[PDB]
Write a protein that binds this ligand. Structure first.
Ligand SMILES: CCCCCCCCCCCCCCCCCC(=O)OC[C@H](CO[C@@H]1O[C@H](CO[C@H]2O[C@H](CO)[C@H](O)[C@H](O)[C@H]2O)[C@H](O)[C@H](O)[C@H]1O)OC(=O)CCCCCCCCCCCCCCCCC
Ligand code: CLA
Ligand code: CLA
Ligand code: CLA
Ligand code: CLA
Ligand code: CLA
Ligand code: CLA
Ligand code: CLA
Ligand SMILES: CCCCCCCCCCCCCCCCCC(=O)OC[C@H](CO[C@@H]1O[C@H](CO)[C@H](O)[C@H](O)[C@H]1O)OC(=O)CCCCCCCCCCCCCCCCC
Ligand SMILES: CC1=C(/C=C/C(C)=C/C=C/C(C)=C/C=C/C=C(C)/C=C/C=C(C)/C=C/C2=C(C)CCCC2(C)C)C(C)(C)CCC1
Lengths: 119, 484, 187, 28
C-alpha cells in the first residue's frame, strides 16, 4: 500500500521528514483462498480435518492486521507565491505486504514528485 | 487373424487347453493370495490391538485369515494381543507359504495340461469328435461343491473338527475365533446371528449333494436342452457370469451393512453405526448407569474402555474417505496413541452443552453447541463481527473426564474452540502423525474398499452376463447375417 | 374435512399478507411468508419468527421482568436504547485493525441510530420506538435495519425487535417490517 | 437405574438421527 496516511512531518523548508501510518494491505474481512481470515473467516484449515495444530499457527488465526509505520522525506523544489502552490520531490520507505502476518515485510523505497496548494 | 480382444478364444473348442488356462488363472490367484499375505505380514504392526487394529493399517487379507481361524504368527505375536506359544504350521506365514506352493504346483500342472492337450478323454466315444457332456460335468462339479459346503459347515465353524469362526460381542470389544452352534430356528436367518452360518452351510450343502445327484442322473429334456443352449460352453459362461455377479452384489451388500460374517474387529465399523449412534448411545448408557451407582463423572468416564470410545470416532467411518486417498487409515490420520477423554462443554450459566456431530455426508461441518432441549446455545461463528452465540460471548468452558486429560478444565476461548472442533468428530484421541507423515484427510476402512471393488466388479460382470449370453443365443448370426 | 370438497370457482381467505398472533399479554401481526423459529439468542425471548427466504429478516418478542414501574422510569428513549447495547450482537474479533473504511480504529461493526420517538395506544400506553442501521466491515447485505418497540406493563418489559437486511429492505421488506412494528400492541 | 428420557435428551443434541430418538417416536 503506497500510502502517506497521517504523515506528520517536520524539518526545514528545504527538506522536512516524518512518519506516516501504513495500514494492513488486506482488511480483516478479507478471506484467504481457503476461507481463513480475521472477523469473517474460518481460523482453521478445514480442508484438513486432522491438521489444525501449532505447525500452522502463523497461517491459522494469526491474521495480524497490526498497522505499521513508514518514513518519508519531502523536499520543496518550486513555489508559486501568487498561486500559493508548491511542488517538489519526495522519498519514502514503507514495509511491503505482510500478507496478514504470513511472511515478513520487505522494505519498499519510493521516490517521486509531489504537488500541493496552500490555503 | 484374431483381433487382440479375441485371442483367448483359441481355446474355446479345446478342452485340454481350456483346463490349462483355467489352471493358470487359479495359479495366479493363489500366488497373489500368498504374496499379498507376505506383504501384509511384512508391513503389519501387531503391538497394539487397541487403537491400532488391522483395519487401521489397511490390511485386506489379514481380516479374512483371522475370520476363518488363523490368528497366530511365527513371529511370536497373536492378533488378539497375547503371546504365541506354538503358532503351528497354520500361522499367517504358513497360509502364505501354502497358497504360494499351491500356485507353483498349479503352474506346473497348467504346463502339462497345455502340452498334452489332445487327450482321448475329451473325445466323443461315438462320433470321435471332441465334446464335453456339460450336464454331467455340472452334476459332478456341483456334487463336489455341495460335499465341500457341507463339510465346511459341519466340521469347520462348528468346531467339531475345525477351529470355528470369529465371534464377537455386539460392540466389538471382545472377539475371538470360537466354535458356533447352528441356529435351526427362524433366528438362523438373522443376518447378524452367527449360528446361521453353520446351519446354512450344512443344510444348503446337503441340498447341493442331492441336487448333484439329480443333475448327474437325469438328462435334460430336448426342449430344455435346445432352449438353454446346453452343449455350448459359452452358455455355461453366461450363466456362471450371472451367478458370480449376483454373489458379488450379495457380498458387497453384506459387508457394507455389516453381518455376522464381517465383524467390526476385522474390517472396522460400518457407517450405519455412526449414523445411528450405535456406540455413542452405548457409551452414554454405561456412563449413566455408573452415575446412578453413585460414581462421579470422572470415575464413570474412566470406566469406559478405550476401544469402545475409539469406535465412536468419525475417522473410523468407512464412508469418510476418498477414491484416491490411498493406503492405510493411519496414512491419512495419525496413529492413535491414547484417548484424551470425554469433553463436557458448559456455559457460564452452568447449562450443559453438546457439540453437534458431523454427519457422514459432510466433508466440513460448522461447530454448534446445543442445549439439552435442542436449542443452539453456542458456536464458532463464521462472521466474528456482531456474533450472537460466540464462545467468548457465552463463556464456554470444557472439562475432560477420563482419558489422558482427566479432571482438566480449559476456559481460554482458543482451546475451547479447538476442542469443540475436535469433538464434532466424535471422541477425541491423540494421534502421532510424524511416523507415517500423515497428511490429515480420512481414508476408508478395508470394508469400504472391499465393497467398492466388488460392486464395480459386479456391474462389469452384469455387462459380461449380457454380452457372453447374447453371443450364446445368437451364435448362428454372430458369424454374420444373411440379410432378412 | 374429508368430504369438504375443493375450492373450484371459490374465493380466497385472505390476501393481506399478515396473520394475527396472540401472546401472553401482547397481540401482533406476522408476515404470512415468515415461519416460526426455534432459536433463542437471548434466554428471555418468548416469541420469534423468521423469513422463509432470507433468515436475516426475522423478529422476536422478549418479555422479561423489570424493576422499573413504567417504561419512562428507564429515562430518555436514547438512554434506554443505550442500555440494550447487546441486542446488536457482539464483536468477537479483537485484533488491531485500521484498514477498514468508515469504521473507527479496532472496530469492525458500527450501529447508527437513525431515529427515536415515543408512541401512544388506545389506552394511552407509551411505547419507545427505535430505528437502527448496523453496518459491518464485510458489509453483509449492505447493513441491517433494526426496529425496536419497547413497553413496560405489569412489572414486565416487552421488547419487539425486527431485523431486515438492507438488500431486502430496498426491495419491499420495509412494508412487512413496518407492519410488524405497527401491529405490536400490549395491554 | 438409567433415566431413559435423559439418555434420549443427551443423544438428540449431538445426533438427532440416533436410533434412540427414532425408536417409539410417535409415543413421545
Ligand atoms: C479342501 C479344504 C481342506 C481344508 C482343511 C485344511 C486344514 C487342515 O486340515 O489342517 C489342520 C490339520 C493339520 O494338523 C495339525 O492340526 C492341529 C490342530 O489339531 C486339531 O485336531 C486334533 C486331532 O487331530 C484335535 O482333535 C483338535 O481338533 C485340534 O487340536 C494344528 O492346526 C496344527 O497346526 C496342524 O499341523 O489337519 C489334519 O489334522 C490332517 C488333515 C485333515 C484333513
Ligand atoms: C470369468 C469371466 C469371463 C470369461 C471366462 C470371459 C471369456 C471371454 N471373453 Mg469376456 N467379459 C467378461 C467376462 C469373461 N469373459 C466381463 C465381466 C465382461 C464385461 C467387461 C466381458 C466382456 C467381453 C467382451 C466385449 C468380449 C469378451 C470376449 C471373451 C472371449 C475372448 C476374451 C479375450 O481373448 O480377450 C482378450 C483380453 C486381453 C487381450 C487383455 C485385456 C486387458 C484388460 C482390458 C485389462 C486386464 C485385466 C487384468 C490384467 C486382470 C484383472 C481382471 C480381474 C480382476 C477380474 C473369451 C472366451 C470377446 C469375445 O466375445 O470373443 C469373441 C469380446 O469381444 N468379453
Ligand atoms: C478388490 C481387491 C482389492 C481390494 C478391495 C484392496 C484393498 C486395499 N488394498 Mg490392495 N491389492 C489388490 C487388491 C485389492 N486391494 C491386488 C490385486 C494387489 C496386487 C497388485 C494389491 C496390492 C496392494 C498393495 C501393495 C497395497 C494394497 C493396499 C490396500 C489397502 C489400501 C487402500 C487402497 O487400495 O488404496 C486405493 C486404491 C486405489 C486408488 C485404486 C483405485 C482404482 C482405480 C479407479 C483404477 C483406475 C486405473 C486407471 C484406469 C488407469 C490410469 C491410472 C494410471 C495413471 C496409473 C486397501 C484396504 C495397501 C495397504 O494398505 O498396505 C497394507 C498396499 O500397500 N494392495
Ligand atoms: C473351503 C472350506 C475351508 C476353508 C476355506 C478352510 C480354511 C481354513 N481351515 Mg479348514 N476345514 C474344512 C474346510 C475349510 N477350511 C473342512 C471341510 C474340514 C473338515 C476336514 C476342515 C478342518 C480344519 C481343521 C482341523 C483345521 C482347519 C484349519 C483352517 C485354517 C488354516 C488351514 C489353511 O490355511 O489351509 C491352507 C491350505 C492350502 C492353501 C493348500 C496347500 C496346498 C499344498 C501346497 C499341497 C502340497 C501337497 C484356514 C483358515 C486349521 C486351523 O484351525 O487354523 C489354525 C485347522 O486346524 N480346517
Ligand atoms: C435352515 C437352513 C438354512 C439357514 C439357517 C440359512 C441361513 C442363511 N442363508 Mg441359506 N439356504 C438354505 C438354507 C439355510 N439358510 C438352503 C437349503 C438353500 C438352497 C441351497 C439356501 C440358499 C441360500 C442363498 C442363495 C443365500 C442364502 C443366504 C442365507 C443367509 C441370509 C442372511 C443374510 O444376511 O444374507 C442376505 C441375502 C440376501 C439379501 C439375498 C437377497 C439378494 C436379492 C434378492 C438380489 C440382490 C442382487 C440382485 C442381482 C439384484 C441386483 C442389485 C440391485 C441393487 C440392482 C443366512 C445366514 C444368503 C447369504 O448367503 O447371505 C449372505 C444367500 O443369498 N441361503
Ligand atoms: C487348496 C485349498 C485351499 C484352502 C484350504 C484355502 C484357504 C484359504 N484361502 Mg485360498 N485359494 C485356493 C485354495 C485354498 N485356500 C485356490 C486353489 C485359490 C486360487 C483360486 C485360492 C485363492 C485365494 C485367495 C485370492 C484368497 C484366499 C484366501 C484364503 C484364506 C481365507 C479363505 C476365505 O475365508 O475365503 C472365503 C471363501 C468363500 C467366500 C467361498 C465362497 C463360496 C461361493 C460363494 C460358492 C457359491 C457358488 C456355489 C458353487 C453354489 C453351489 C450351490 C450349493 C447348493 C452347493 C484361507 C486360509 C484369502 C486370504 O485370506 O488370503 C490368504 C484370499 O483372499 N485363497
Ligand atoms: C485367458 C483364458 C481364460 C482364463 C484365464 C479363464 C479363467 C476363468 N474361467 Mg474361463 N473360459 C475360457 C478362457 C479362460 N478362462 C474360454 C475360452 C472359455 C470358453 C468360452 C471359457 C469358459 C468358462 C466357463 C464356462 C467358466 C469359466 C470359468 C473361469 C473362472 C474359473 C477358474 C477355474 O475354473 O479354475 C478353478 C475354479 C476355482 C478355484 C473356483 C474359484 C474360481 C474363482 C475365479 C477363483 C477366485 C475366488 C474368488 C476371489 C472368490 C470366490 C467366490 C466366487 C467363486 C463366487 C476363471 C477366472 C468359470 C467361472 O467362474 O465363470 C465365471 C466358468 O463357469 N470359463
Ligand atoms: C437387465 C437384466 C438382465 C437381462 C437383460 C438379462 C438377459 C438374459 N439373460 Mg440374465 N440374469 C440377470 C439379469 C438379466 N439377464 C440376473 C440379475 C440374474 C441373476 C444372477 C440372471 C441370471 C441368468 C441366467 C442363469 C441365465 C440368464 C440368461 C439370459 C439370456 C436369456 C434370456 C433370459 O432368460 O433372461 C432372463 C430372465 C429374466 C430376467 C426374467 C426375470 C423376471 C422375474 C421372474 C421377475 C421377478 C419378480 C419378483 C416377484 C419381484 C419381487 C422382488 C422385489 C420384492 C425386489 C438373456 C440375454 C440365460 C442365458 O445366458 O442364456 C444362455 C441364463 O442361463 N440370466
Ligand atoms: C499401474 C496402475 C496402478 C493403478 C492403481 C494405482 C493406485 C495408487 C497407488 O499408488 O496406491 C497404491 C495403494 C497403496 O498406496 C500407498 O499406501 C501406503 C500405505 O500402505 C501409503 O498410504 C502411501 O501413501 C500410499 O500411496 O495400494 C494399492 O495397490 C491399491 C490397490 C488396488 C485395488 C484397490 C481396491 C480395488 C479397486 C478397484 C477394483 C476395480 C474396479 C473396477 C474398475 C474401476
Ligand atoms: C514355479 C514353482 C514354485 C513356485 C514359485 C513361486 C515363488 C511362485 C509365486 C508366484 C507369485 C508371486 C505370483 C503372484 C502373482 C500376482 C498376481 C497374479 C496379481 C496381479 C495384480 C493384478 C491382476 C491387479 C490389477 C489391478 C491394479 C494393478 C490396479 C487396480 C485395479 C486392479 C486390482 C485390477 C515352487 C517353488 C512351488 C516349485 C514348483 C514350481
Amino acid at each position: 500500500l503506497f500510502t502517506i496516511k497521517e504523515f506528520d512531518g517536520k524539518g526545514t523548508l528545504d527538506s522536512f521528514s516524518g512518519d506516516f501510518l501504513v495500514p494492513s494491505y488486506r482488511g480483516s474481512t478479507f478471506l484467504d483462498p481457503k476461507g481463513r481470515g480475521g472477523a469473517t473467516g474460518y481460523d482453521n484449515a478445514i480442508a484438513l480435518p486432522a491438521k489444525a495444530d501449532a505447525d500452522e499457527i502463523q497461517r491459522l488465526n494469526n491474521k495480524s492486521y497490526t498497522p505499521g509505520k513508514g518514513s518519508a522525506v519531502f523536499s520543496v523544489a518550486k513555489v508559486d507565491t501568487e498561486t500559493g502552490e508548491i511542488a517538489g520531490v519526495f522519498e519514502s520507505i514503507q514495509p511491503s505486504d505482510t500478507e496478514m502476518g504470513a511472511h515478513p515485510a520487505k522494505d519498499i523505497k519510493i521516490t517521486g514528485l509531489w504537488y500541493g496548494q496552500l490555503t | 487373424g484374431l483381433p487382440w480382444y479375441r485371442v483367448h478364444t483359441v481355446v474355446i473348442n479345446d478342452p485340454g487347453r481350456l483346463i490349462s488356462v483355467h489352471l493358470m488363472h487359479t495359479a495366479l490367484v493363489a500366488g497373489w493370495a500368498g504374496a499379498m499375505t507376505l506383504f501384509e505380514i511384512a508391513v503389519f504392526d501387531p503391538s497394539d490391538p487397541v487403537l491400532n487394529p488391522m483395519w487401521r493399517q489397511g490390511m485386506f487379507v489379514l481380516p479374512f485369515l483371522t475370520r476363518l481361524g488363523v490368528t497366530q504368527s511365527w513371529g511370536g505375536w497373536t492378533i488378539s494381543g497375547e503371546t504365541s506359544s506354538n503358532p503351528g504350521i497354520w500361522s499367517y506365514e504358513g497360509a502364505a507359504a501354502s497358497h504360494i506352493v499351491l500356485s507353483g504346483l498349479l503352474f506346473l500342472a497348467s504346463v502339462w495340461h497345455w502340452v498334452y492337450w489332445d487327450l482321448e478323454l475329451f473325445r466323443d466315444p461315438r462320433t470321435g469328435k471332441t465334446a464335453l457332456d456339460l450336464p454331467k460335468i455340472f452334476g459332478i462339479h456341483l456334487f463336489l461343491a455341495g460335499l465341500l459346503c457341507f463339510g465346511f459347515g459341519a466340521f469347520h465353524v462348528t468346531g467339531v473338527f475345525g477351529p470355528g469362526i470369529w465371534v464377537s460381542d455386539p460392540y466389538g470389544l471382545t472377539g475371538s475365533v470360537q466354535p458356533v452352534a447352528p441356529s435351526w430356528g427362524a433366528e438362523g436367518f438373522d443376518p447378524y446371528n452367527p449360528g446361521g452360518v453353520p446351519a446354512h452351510h450344512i443344510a444348503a450343502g446337503i441340498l447341493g449333494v442331492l441336487a448333484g445327484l439329480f443333475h448327474l442322473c437325469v438328462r435334460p429334456s430336448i426342449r430344455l436342452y435346445f432352449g438353454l443352449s446346453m452343449g455350448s460352453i459359452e452358455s455355461v459362461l453366461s450363466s456362471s457370469i450371472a451367478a458370480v455377479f449376483w454373489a458379488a452384489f450379495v457380498v458387497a451388500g453384506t459387508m457394507w451393512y455389516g453381518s455376522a460374517a464381517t465383524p467390526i474387529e476385522l474390517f472396522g465399523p460400518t457407517r450405519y453405526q455412526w449414523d445411528q449412534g450405535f456406540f455413542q448411545q452405548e457409551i452414554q448408557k454405561r456412563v449413566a448407569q455408573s452415575t446412578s451407582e453413585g460414581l462421579s463423572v470422572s470415575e464413570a468416564w474412566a470406566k469406559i474402555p478405550e476401544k469402545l470410545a475409539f469406535y465412536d470416532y468419525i475417522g473410523n467411518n468407512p464412508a469418510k474417505g476418498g477414491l484416491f486417498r490411498t493406503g492405510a487409515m493411519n496414512s491419512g490420520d495419525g496413529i492413535a496413541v491414547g484417548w484424551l477423554g470425554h469433553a463436557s462443554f458448559k456455559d457460564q450459566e452452568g447449562r450443559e452443552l453438546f457439540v453437534r456431530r458431523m454427519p457422514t455426508f459432510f466433508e466440513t461441518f460448522p461447530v454448534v453447541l446445543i442445549d439439552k432441549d435442542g436449542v443452539v446455545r453456542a458456536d464458532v461463528p463464521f462472521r466474528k463481527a456482531e456474533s450472537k452465540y460466540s464462545i467468548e460471548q457465552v463463556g464456554v468452558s470444557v472439562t475432560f473426564y477420563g482419558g489422558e486429560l482427566n479432571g482438566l478444565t480449559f476456559t481460554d476461548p482458543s482451546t475451547v474452540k479447538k476442542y469443540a472442533r475436535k469433538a464434532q468428530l466424535g471422541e477425541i484421541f491423540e494421534f502421532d502423525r510424524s511416523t507415517l507423515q500423515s497428511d490429515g484427510v480420512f481414508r476408508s476402512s478395508p470394508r469400504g474398499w472391499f465393497t467398492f471393488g466388488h460392486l464395480s466388479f459386479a456391474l462389469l460382470f452384469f455387462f459380461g452376463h449380457i454380452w457372453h449370453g447374447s453371443r450364446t443365443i445368437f451364435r448362428d448370426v454372430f458369424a454374420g447375417i444373411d440379410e432378412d | 374435512a374429508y368430504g369438504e370438497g375443493a375450492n373450484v370457482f371459490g374465493r380466497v381467505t385472505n390476501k393481506s399478507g399478515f396473520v394475527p398472533y396472540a401472546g401472553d399479554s401482547f397481540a401482533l401481526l406476522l408476515p404470512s411468508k415468515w415461519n416460526p423459529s426455534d432459536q433463542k439468542e437471548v434466554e428471555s425471548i418468548v416469541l420469534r419468527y423468521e423469513d422463509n427466504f432470507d433468515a436475516v429478516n426475522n423478529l422476536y418478542v422478549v418479555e422479561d421482568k423489570s424493576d422499573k414501574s413504567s417504561i419512562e422510569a428507564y429515562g430518555t428513549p436514547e438512554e434506554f436504547i443505550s442500555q440494550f447495547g447487546y441486542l446488536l450482537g457482539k464483536q468477537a474479533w479483537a485484533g488491531q485493525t485500521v484498514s477498514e473504511g468508515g469504521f473507527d480504529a479496532n472496530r469492525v461493526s458500527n450501529a447508527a441510530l437513525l431515529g427515536v420517538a415515543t408512541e401512544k395506544d388506545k389506552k394511552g400506553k407509551t411505547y419507545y420506538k427505535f430505528e437502527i442501521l448496523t453496518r459491518t466491515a464485510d458489509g453483509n447485505e449492505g447493513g441491517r435495519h433494526q426496529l425496536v418497540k419497547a413497553t413496560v406493563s405489569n412489572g414486565k418489559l416487552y421488547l419487539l425487535k425486527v431485523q431486515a437486511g438492507d438488500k431486502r429492505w430496498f426491495k419491499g421488506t420495509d412494508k412487512e417490517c413496518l407492519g410488524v412494528l405497527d401491529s405490536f400492541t400490549v395491554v | 437405574r438409567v433415566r431413559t428420557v435423559l439418555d434420549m435428551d443427551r443423544k438428540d443434541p449431538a445426533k438427532e438421527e440416533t436410533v434412540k430418538e427414532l425408536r417409539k417416536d410417535i409415543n413421545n
